[PDB]
Amino acid sequence: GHKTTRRVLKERPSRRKGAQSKRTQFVRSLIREVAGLAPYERRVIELLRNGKDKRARKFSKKKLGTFGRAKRKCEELQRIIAESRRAH
Amino acid sequence: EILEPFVDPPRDRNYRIEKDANGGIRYVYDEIDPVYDSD
Amino acid sequence: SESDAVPQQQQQENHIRQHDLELESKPEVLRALEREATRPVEKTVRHQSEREREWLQRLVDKHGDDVAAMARDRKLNPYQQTASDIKRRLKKAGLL
Amino acid sequence: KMPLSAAPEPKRRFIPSKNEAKQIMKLVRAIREGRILPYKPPEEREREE
Amino acid sequence: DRSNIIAERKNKQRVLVLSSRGVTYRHRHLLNDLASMLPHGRKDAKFDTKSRLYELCELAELYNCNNVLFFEARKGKDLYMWFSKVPNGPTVKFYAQNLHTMEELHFQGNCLKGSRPILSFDAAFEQEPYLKVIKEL
Amino acid sequence: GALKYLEELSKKKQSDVVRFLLRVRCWEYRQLNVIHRASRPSRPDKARRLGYKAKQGYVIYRVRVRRGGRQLKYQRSLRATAEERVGRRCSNLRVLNSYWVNQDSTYKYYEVILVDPNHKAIRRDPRINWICNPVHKHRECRGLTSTGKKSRGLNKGHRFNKTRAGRRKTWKRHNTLSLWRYR
Amino acid sequence: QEFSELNLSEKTTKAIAEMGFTKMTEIQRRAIPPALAGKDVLGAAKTGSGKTLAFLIPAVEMLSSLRFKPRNGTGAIVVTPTRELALQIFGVARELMKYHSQTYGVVIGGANRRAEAEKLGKGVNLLIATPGRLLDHLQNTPFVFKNLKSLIIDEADRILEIGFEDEMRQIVKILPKEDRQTMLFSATQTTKVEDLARISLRPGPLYINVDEEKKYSTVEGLEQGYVVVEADKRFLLLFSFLKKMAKKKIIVFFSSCNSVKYYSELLQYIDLPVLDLHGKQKQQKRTNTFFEFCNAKSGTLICTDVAARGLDIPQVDWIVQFDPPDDPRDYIHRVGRTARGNNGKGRSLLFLQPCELGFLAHLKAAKVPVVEYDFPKNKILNVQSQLEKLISTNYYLNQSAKEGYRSYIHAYASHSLRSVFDVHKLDLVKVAKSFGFSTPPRVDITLGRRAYGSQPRQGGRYK
RNA sequence: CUAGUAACGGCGAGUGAAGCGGCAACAGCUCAAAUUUGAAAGCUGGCUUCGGCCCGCGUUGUAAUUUGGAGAGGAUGCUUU
């Protein structure tokens, strides 16, 4: 509508209120190994180690409630499988 | 076997390359068969 | 002229003074308020402690004017202060 | 192999303590007002008592 | 042979019936009433709006489906319908205007469930290529 | 330091370590009294982020609450019932906050951080002595804790139109016939 | 022609007078008057002629004449290949704007991205940048670059050699073009340099040639000595060398200015007298120090290899390359020729770790005779415990050690010969022990299938 | 005032807001997630000749610093009690 000269704004410190911090990633990874897995996470990991990815995604979706949360959990457990094989 | 004495030595696809209707790039993936899963 | 289209260049007259402003017929109360706001005041210049003067004195008695050597000195300057800070403290003490 | 924090180390970890300096100056002010008793080495306290 | 079709030549067709997040009671009722007519259709709901559009093909790959019928809802009032062949086929986006579901109590008729329906097209469904693509979808 | 790790651990409550520890503690709490004094918080990260301090005048109290419906559902939260029962046992204390610590098949266990308003360590601290004022007498009974703030719908937005300033005050404002002098 | 002849501003004249420069080279005298007239400049000068002032005088004059402010963003952008060249130009620009109210800043790959983002958001009038980080800040950070009037591209042959071709293509595409004066410099003239001059500069350039035609790059009359030393003892060996080759002339080359400053303070405390040439001092101090070293019977001068690239190297007994060379071809040929000398032959020693020995294979391919220098283990003066106590107790030396360690790691990471010098093969604990640390400080070494049903995007706006 | 509007409803009885706009009044802050680590620097009690002495709480964290349209650490030079 009306013409005004747009400004470039100062970078918001509230932007990315999640974590790009390496220390929180370190703490999250260490706790995962120390604590272990949930029973449903162990079932998903035993399906993923057998190559049954479709069943794993359906089980995760059923027990989490969203396809995005299921995808994120399946990627996390696949990453855990990858580092476990690398350590093996 | 390096040829130039002081330079750095030079150094699972699921789609198909097909021309689209407009003339750019179109990707053709593996077709889905409607076979019912065991689960 | 406005070489760069700046809306603020007509407004002019990165650190500013923080604790005050630098501001540059009528009713009698207004004139009295200006007079009492414009009258000169004292400053109460902050002095230095005896131990700080002794520290700056001992620092001068060994190096004289080499403020870089005084900063390097670990024995006589335990808090490893920068030569600029010690020079400022010497200037405030009048020990140059 | 490296620390997790890349933050700088504060200068306070390389210079003598400032809290103890304030405490010692408070004690010096207390001795000068005679409020507290000065230092006597323990053998003096043993031979006095 | 797990095709679940017993015939001479099999018409392997599977539909994935899906609804968005902000659907209404009317849109949900239309979803339930339309998915009841399709035996080869699977019902799921609450697809994530912020997610990409092609992720619907990944959701269909999970259920071995080659058709998706998407119920996109905008503002909690507007219904858009997506008819798409999943791997590489065309997509038809539609807007649904006036809805009258099966729960409406004035219709006085009813039919079986999975009875192979006679698909009655219009004569404009061959005299225009876009209506031909819609017709075949 | 360690509280970041404990927060990340508390976020995995079905993992082996946390599941094992929760079951052993649930067994012990089941065989204790319904409302019993806890020497220290079992979840120090959670208590610390809710305002608990290891200072004289701060008290933890563990409480078990029978879970389930009251098909009439109790519009009061089980966490609110916990704070009210503890607030009556410790009628000289002010309920600061509370948090979930455990759950069983028939009970849900919560820990309530309380504050003594008559201790001199609390009355001298400007960060907590607001609770010494008599307007904070029995905050759990008037919906003034966290559960009370959630159950009363005290949020900003169009979704909370009838409850953001009080439901009954809004209803009284909308049902009042205002007649001015010049009509 | 002298610097007082042109009608520069009085602030710029005073700054150049303080530097001590009263006479120009050919490239300054032939580039500054046309560039002050607003004409784009194509150059053929090498490193060390004085091209830095030749592109910094018109930028400073433009910034002062248009009265730029920190709220106006970038006015001039100087793109450099490496971070140490950018830091040298930043030191020169800091000396040039001593009286100018305009701001100046550096943006280099390997530094803090968030601190650089805040620096760019506050407003940097003259921006000396590295292409990858400049492109990253131009694409993902909010800062004002709409008032750009000067784009200087410096040493374009090296930037096209490293592989920043597509980065500069996107940089020129992003940057505003109308009323922008472009000045591009390159010591050679390739097809990629011609392509860059075609996309960047306007249809009418001005082509200026200041280059010696008699380059003596013969591959037979040379002899390069090397010493194989592990990382954790490297400096110790140098210290022993610098205490055993006293009463001699030694030039030592380091990769960064920060490590030169750290080792200067370190050798001041560890009672070994040296002379330092790093880009954090006054130009006058540096010229006087180099003049004093050039007219001395003995002594050792420590400096950066890129800082002494444009320096008249005198007759010295030893030329030591302590850090990896930035330009290995230039190092071998030209630095070996300046090490051999006009009179009785000096020697050029190179410090090699036992993970960069493939350089020797390169010396096998170039047919350059090599000489191996070994050292006894018992003749190394072990001052490691004193060094660690000094680093642990002195806050200024700890800061300098951290800065030198970070600068060494980043310069090693941004290396042209990544096969010979790879940061991933470096043991950070040992090199930090060489710098004087018990534990290595934290640094960043670095700094399938397409989606099912996904067809390429054909519309929409992404910011 | 919006406004008996939107919205919901044996779409009957009816029920029934909110943003903007004008006004009254206006005021902003405290923690948790950091190692004070070159010095628990913090606090409740008791004894008092009232000035400073003991026991205890507390390191499973009491002071100071910081609260994301922020902040810290160094450097820097002015300005404040």
CA gap F55, F62 in Å, rounded: 18
> In Å, what is the separation between the CA of A8 and the C1' of H38?
46
CA gap G396, G387 in Å, rounded: 14
Chain centroid to Cα F18, Å, comes to 23
Residue of G nearest to C8 (CA): G71
Name which of C47, C48, C72 is nearest C59 in CA terms: C72
For residue C44, which nucleotide's C1' is closest to its Cα?
H81
Quote the tokens at residue F8: 């990340």
* 3 state SS of G393: helix
CA gap D4, G262 in Å, rounded: 24
Contact indicator for G451, E58 with CB cutoff of 8 Å: yes
Contacts of G232 (CB under 8 A, 6+ apart): G427, G429, G430, G431, G433, G434
Rounded (5°) CA angle B5-B8-B13: 145
Helix (H) or strand (E) holding G291: helix G283-294
Please give the DSSP secondary-structure letter assigned to residue G304: E
Q: How was this structure determined?
A: cryo-EM
B1 touches chain A (CB under 8 A): no
Name which of A34, A64, A25 is nearest F16 in CA terms: A34
Beta bridge partners of B29: B15
Please state at what angle helix G10-19 crosses helix G283-294, rounded to 10 degrees: 20
Please give the DSSP secondary-structure letter assigned to residue G417: -
CA gap G76, G97 in Å, rounded: 14
The values of phi and psi at residue E54, to 5°, are: -75, -15
G142 touches chain A (CB under 8 A): yes
| Residue G456: burial class (beta carbons within 10 Å; 0-12, 13-18, 19+) | exposed
Q: What is the dihedral of CA G364, G369, G373, G374, to 10 degrees?
A: 50
CA gap G282, G18 in Å, rounded: 9
CA gap E2, B33 in Å, rounded: 11
CA gap G207, G161 in Å, rounded: 22
CA gap E10, D45 in Å, rounded: 109
| Residue G87: burial class (beta carbons within 10 Å; 0-12, 13-18, 19+) | buried
**In angstroms, what is the C-alpha Rg of chain D?**
20
Name which of G283, G341, G340, G332 is nearest G307 in CA terms: G283
* 3 state SS of C31: helix
Beta bridge partners of E73: E79
Partner-chain contact G453 B29, CB within 8 Å: yes
- Count of beta carbons in the 10 Å neighbourhood of residue F165: 11
CA gap E56, E44 in Å, rounded: 12
Partner-chain contact A11 G144, CB within 8 Å: no
Strands G299-304 and F107-115: unpaired
Please give the DSSP secondary-structure letter assigned to residue G371: E
Give the position of tokens 């390069």: G224
The answer to whether some atom of strand H lies closer than 7 Å to the beta carbon of D34 is: no
Give the position of tokens 């075609």: G198
Rounded (5°) CA angle E84-E89-E94: 30
G366 residue type, one letter = A
> In Å, what is the separation between the CA of F80 and the C1' of H43?
32
| Residue D39: burial class (beta carbons within 10 Å; 0-12, 13-18, 19+) | exposed
Quote the tokens at residue A76: 């996390």
Output b/e per residue, F66-105; b: 16+ Cβ within 10 A.
eeeeeeeeeeeebbbbbbbbbbebbeebbbbbbbebbbee
The answer to whether some atom of strand H lies closer than 7 Å to the beta carbon of A13 is: yes
Partner-chain contact A54 E59, CB within 8 Å: no
Contacts of C65 (CB under 8 A, 6+ apart): C96
Give chain F residues 50-69 with Cβ within 7 A of strand H.
51, 53-56
The answer to whether some atom of strand H lies closer than 7 Å to the beta carbon of A17 is: yes
Could you say which residues from 10 to 69 on chain E have a Cβ atom under 8 Å away from some Cβ of chain B?
12-14, 40, 60-61, 63-66
Please give the DSSP secondary-structure letter assigned to residue C71: H
Beta bridge partners of G106: G128
Contacts of G441 (CB under 8 A, 6+ apart): D2, D3, D6, G402, G405, G406, G432
Residue E70 Cα distances to C89, E54, G201, angstroms: 76, 12, 53
Quote the tokens at residue G430: 């040992």
E43 residue type, one letter = K
Asked if chain D contacts chain F via 3 or more Cβ pairs within 8 Å, the reply is no
CA gap F52, F44 in Å, rounded: 8
CA gap F53, F75 in Å, rounded: 32
Name which of G302, G184, G200 is nearest G241 in CA terms: G302
CA gap C48, C31 in Å, rounded: 40
The values of phi and psi at residue D38, to 5°, are: -70, -170
Q: Which region, left, alpha or beta, applies to residue G352 given φ > 0 means left and ψ of -120 to 50 means alpha?
A: beta
Residue E135 Cα distances to E36, F100, G405, angstroms: 21, 58, 70
Chain H positions with any atom < 7 A from a protein CB: 1, 16-18, 30-39, 41-45, 51-53, 56-63, 68-70, 72-81
Chain centroid to Cα G168, Å, comes to 19
The values of phi and psi at residue G134, to 5°, are: -65, -40
Name which of G445, G261, G421 is nearest G326 in CA terms: G421
Please state at what angle helix A22-35 crosses helix F2-10, rounded to 10 degrees: 60
Neighbours of chain G (3+ CB pairs under 8 A): A, B, C, D, E
CA gap G343, F8 in Å, rounded: 70
Contacts of G205 (CB under 8 A, 6+ apart): G40, G41, G42, G197
For residue F7, which nucleotide's C1' is closest to its Cα?
H33
Contact indicator for G50, G28 with CB cutoff of 8 Å: yes
The answer to whether some atom of strand H lies closer than 7 Å to the beta carbon of C17 is: yes
Task: Measure CA to C1' and name the residue nearest H35.
Answer: F1
Name which of G289, G240, G232 is nearest G260 in CA terms: G289
Could you say which residues from 1 to 49 on chain D have a Cβ atom under 8 Å away from some Cβ of chain A?
4-5
The answer to whether some atom of strand H lies closer than 7 Å to the beta carbon of F172 is: no
Rounded (5°) CA angle A50-A51-A53: 120
Chain centroid to Cα F73, Å, comes to 20
Partner-chain contact C80 G395, CB within 8 Å: yes
Residues in chain B: 39
- Count of beta carbons in the 10 Å neighbourhood of residue E15: 23
CA gap E84, E73 in Å, rounded: 17
Q: What share of chain G is helix, strand, coil (3-state, %, to 5)?
A: 45, 15, 45
Q: Which region, left, alpha or beta, applies to residue E104 given φ > 0 means left and ψ of -120 to 50 means alpha?
A: beta
Concatenated DSSP letters of G7-70: ---HHHHHHHHHHT--B--HHHHHHHHHHHTT--EEE---TTSSHHHHHHHHHHHHHHHTT--G
The answer to whether some atom of strand H lies closer than 7 Å to the beta carbon of C88 is: yes
Beta bridge partners of G254: G304
Could you say which residues from 64 to 83 on chain A have a Cβ atom under 8 Å away from some Cβ of chain E?
66-68
F contacts of A23 (beta carbons < 8 Å) = 4
CA gap E14, E41 in Å, rounded: 6
**First vs last C-alpha separation in chain D:** 58
G144 touches chain A (CB under 8 A): yes
Contact indicator for G68, G209 with CB cutoff of 8 Å: no
CA gap F9, F44 in Å, rounded: 12
- Count of beta carbons in the 10 Å neighbourhood of residue E101: 16
Please give the DSSP secondary-structure letter assigned to residue G2: B
Quote the tokens at residue B11: 């150094």
Quote the tokens at residue G168: 């500069």
Name which of G144, G8, G123, G119 is nearest G64 in CA terms: G8
Quote the tokens at residue E134: 């819609």
Resolution as reported, in Å: 3.0
Q: How many CA atoms lie within 13 A of E127 on its CB side?
A: 4
Output b/e per residue, G172-206; b: 16+ Cβ within 10 A.
beebeeeebbbbbbbbeeeeebeebbeebbeeebb
Residue of E nearest to A69 (CA): E48
**First vs last C-alpha separation in chain G:** 50
- Count of beta carbons in the 10 Å neighbourhood of residue G335: 23
Contact indicator for F111, F98 with CB cutoff of 8 Å: yes
